[PDB]
Structure 1
Amino acid sequence: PLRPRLCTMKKGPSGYGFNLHSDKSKPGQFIRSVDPDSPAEASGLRAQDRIVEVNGVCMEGKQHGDVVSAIRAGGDETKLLVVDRETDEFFKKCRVIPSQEHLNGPLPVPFTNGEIQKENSDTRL
């Protein structure tokens, strides 16, 4: 497969029904669990997904509470852009942060080992 997935869900009587986890061992906010028959599960959210965007705003580099505040501040609805591990394990090789562009359109091309061997440092100024 290897594309990100957008999860649109509406708050139920007791929330969305999933668990977000993060720790110092790795970067990123991950779905530890999703309750059965929950709004989160119906939208297509699954365990071990990593949150990339919350309602069209990028979450790369932000802390856990920032993502949590971003989700709680969206009202009774939220739209999460998420990637599974294999899709996540692909985009780092492209060195590309996933976005809404990748839901439909052409996917990036990974970098070869020889290109990383060059140890290039490039900056657009």
Structure 2
Amino acid sequence: GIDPFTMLRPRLCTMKKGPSGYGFNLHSDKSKPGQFIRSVDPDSPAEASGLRAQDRIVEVNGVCMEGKQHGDVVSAIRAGGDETKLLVVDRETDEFFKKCRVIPSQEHLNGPLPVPFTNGEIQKENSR
């Protein structure tokens, strides 16, 4: 809808090996797990696919890598073949997901994001 916060949604980056590889660098954080975009090359399929800096890898090739290690994620990317699809979330987007305890995925891409407060609504509390 026309919600001012409905823009807090992830993006699916689809990138094929251009020259002889891809053009981005991942950084593994020593406190928080997951691969974050350290830097991306503007003249590569990575930037074209929508690989924003400081964004975190959530899914790769349709596989969710929340809680996975550096080797697991990287090996999955390499096992994608000539191209790979990365799912990333912005700082604002990820903070939104954090506060709602929601894990970003492909469905949230074109979805109107999770419902506020997760549940709420004590509608017809009969409990009989």
**Cα root mean square deviation, aligned:** 4.3
Contact 1:93 1:110 in 2 (8 A): no
State the shift of 1:92 in Å. 1.1
Residues 20 and 92 from structure 1, CA distance in 2 versus in 1: closer, same or farther, beyond 3 angstroms? Answer: same
Residues 105 and 17 from structure 1, CA distance in 2 versus in 1: closer, same or farther, beyond 3 angstroms? Answer: same
What is aligned with 1:74?
80
What is aligned with 2:56?
50
Query: Structure 2 regions of 5+ residues with no counterpart?
Result: 1-7
Larger Rg: 2
What is aligned with 1:24?
30
Residues 114 and 82 from structure 1, CA distance in 2 versus in 1: closer, same or farther, beyond 3 angstroms? Answer: same
Fraction of identical pairs, as percent: 100
TM-score by length of 2: 0.82
Contact 2:11 2:109 in 1 (8 A): yes
Superposed structure 1 runs of 4+ greater than 6 Å apart: 112-121
State the shift of 1:111 in Å. 3.5
Contact 2:56 2:90 in 1 (8 A): yes
Residues 56 and 117 from structure 1, CA distance in 2 versus in 1: closer, same or farther, beyond 3 angstroms? Answer: same
Query: Structure 1 regions of 5+ residues with no counterpart?
Result: none
Question: Could you report, residue by residue, the CA deviation over 1:46-101 in whole angstroms, capped at 9, with x for unpaired residues?
Answer: 11110100011111111011000000111111111110111000001110111111
SS in 1 for 2:33: strand
